[PDB]
Each structure stands twice: as structure tokens, then as C-alpha cells.
RNA sequence: AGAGGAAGUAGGUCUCCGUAGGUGAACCUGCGGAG
């Protein structure tokens, strides 16, 4: 019998207040968004550390910013991953124009480039300041990561998007 | 004015907060801070 307790941010608190994981994984849960913790606990009906770990990754990813749709998608697909990238990782210039300009290049007006790479490379992204979070198969995740570091490197969205699309095609192809 | 003669050129998204107004709990818009 194992339990695991996860802390949350105060951002998504009403989304958590909206309403099942006991029915999902037969795994008993307590919650308190004032101590910012949630308690996953293995009962006699939960059978696997994989069920424990995937419920943990599920709740922590919904905390880290995605919604219930891609959350239960993470719950369903076992081959489906999340990753947390900081923009303070590998840095081309030492000037502190890093946050605003690079995330302007990346997200763009009305999230057009963001949603564009989401639809073009089959992944799902959330942007939270210095921390961005990729969700997908690990190929899509690493691909989105290279697109992110190139759009902070300084290539225009046109060229990085075109290369992104063509490698999306050659990645999707079986033969 | 004259018909002739002759020649030549054709780029800040999502969420949270603090605001001001709006139709008020909420909620929307505008502004300013955080992930």
C-alpha cells in the first residue's frame, strides 16, 4: 500500500473545484487546495505502481496547466508524455531581453504560432512564463522543443514552421 | 495664303492577481504586475 501527495499552484483552483479518479483507477483521493496538496492512495482495488504513477502524472499535469481533455488523454494513452522546459536553459545571448521578446516570437499574436505548431506536430503545449510544458509522444515533444529553441535562436516563424511541417510529414510516414 | 517639282527620316498566446468603467454576485472590456 502506497500513497503519494502532490502540491498544486493557486491558479487552477476552481478548475480543480469542478468535478472521478476513484472510478478511473480505483485509487482513493483526498484534496485540500488551501494546503495546496492532493493525496493519491492505493486501496485494495488499485493493482499497479503504474496506475499510481500515471494518476500522479495526470494530476500534476493538470496542475502544470493543461485541461481535462488532454488530461484524460494522458490518463488513457500509456505511451503519452509530459515535459517541463525552462527558458533559462541554454542561452544564446546574456542580455536580459530574454523573456518578453522570445516568448513574443514563440507565442505570437492570438497564439497563432503556438496553435499552429500544436496542429502541425500533433502535440499540445502550455506556456507559463519561464516554464513551458510540452505534451505528446516523445518524438513530438523533442520536435516541439527544437522548434522552441530555434524560435528563441532567431529564425523566423515562416522558415521554422516550414521545416517543422516537412519533418512532421517525414516523421509521420511509416515507410 | 498656294497647289505643285524634288529629296530625305518613320509578431506576448494561456492562466492567476491588482485595477478603472460597463448591468449587476458573477461576468465583459481597458490598464498595470506575476507564472
Q: Is the CB of residue A12 inside 7 Å of nucleic acid strand B?
A: yes
**Straight-line distance from CA A86 to C1' B22, in Å?**
39
Integer Cα distance of A7 and A22 in angstroms = 19
Distance linking the first and last C-alpha atoms of chain A? 46
Q: For residues A98 and A87, is the Cβ–Cβ distance under 8 A?
A: yes
| Residue A90, C-alpha cell as written in the block | 541554454
| Residue A40, C-alpha cell as written in the block | 493519491
Query: How many Å separate Cα A155 from the centre of its chain?
Result: 24
**Whole-Å CA distances, A153 to A36, A149, A150, A166:** 37, 6, 5, 20
Integer Cα distance of A158 and A170 in angstroms = 19
Task: Return the closest-CA partner of residue A114 out of A67, A76, A147, A66.
Answer: A147
| DSSP tag of A109 | G
Beta-sheet strand order (sheet of A37-42): A3-7, A37-42, A27-32
- Resolution of the PDB structure in angstroms: 4.4
**Straight-line distance from CA A13 to C1' B4, in Å?**
110
Q: Is the CB of residue A109 inside 7 Å of nucleic acid strand B?
A: yes
| DSSP tag of A48 | -
Bridge partners of A27? A42
Q: Is the CB of residue A11 inside 7 Å of nucleic acid strand B?
A: yes
| DSSP tag of A110 | G
Q: Is the CB of residue A131 inside 7 Å of nucleic acid strand B?
A: yes
How buried is residue A143: exposed, middle or buried, by Cβ count under 10 Å (0-12/13-18/19+)?
buried
Q: Which helix (H) or strand (E) holds A13?
A: helix A13-17
Three-state DSSP at A92 gives coil
Q: For residues A52 and A27, is the Cβ–Cβ distance under 8 A?
A: yes
Integer Cα distance of A135 and A60 in angstroms = 13
Task: Extract the runs of DSSP E, i.e. beta strands, from chain A.
Answer: 3-7, 27-32, 37-42, 81-86, 124-128, 131-136
Amino acid at each position: 500500500i502506497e500513497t503519494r501527495k502532490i502540491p498544486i499552484p493557486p491558479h487552477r483552483m476552481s478548475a480543480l473545484k469542478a468535478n472521478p479518479l476513484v472510478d478511473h483507477c480505483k485509487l482513493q483521493v483526498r484534496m485540500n487546495i488551501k494546503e495546496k496538496r492532493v493525496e493519491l492512495r492505493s486501496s485494495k482495488y488499485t493493482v499497479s505502481n503504474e496506475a499510481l504513477q500515471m494518476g500522479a502524472d495526470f494530476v500534476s499535469a493538470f496542475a502544470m496547466g493543461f485541461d481535462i481533455d488532454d488530461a484524460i488523454a494522458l490518463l488513457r494513452l500509456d505511451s503519452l508524455y509530459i515535459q517541463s522546459f525552462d527558458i533559462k536553459d541554454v542561452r544564446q545571448t546574456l542580455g536580459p531581453d530574454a523573456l518578453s521578446r522570445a516568448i513574443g516570437r514563440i507565442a505570437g499574436k492570438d497564439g497563432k504560432t503556438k496553435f499552429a505548431i500544436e496542429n502541425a506536430t500533433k502535440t499540445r503545449i502550455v506556456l507559463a512564463g519561464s516554464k513551458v510544458h510540452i505534451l505528446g509522444a516523445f518524438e513530438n515533444i523533442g520536435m516541439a522543443r527544437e522548434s522552441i529553441v530555434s524560435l528563441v535562436l532567431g529564425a523566423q516563424p515562416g522558415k521554422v514552421y516550414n521545416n517543422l511541417r516537412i519533418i512532421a510529414s517525414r516523421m509521420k510516414e511509416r515507410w
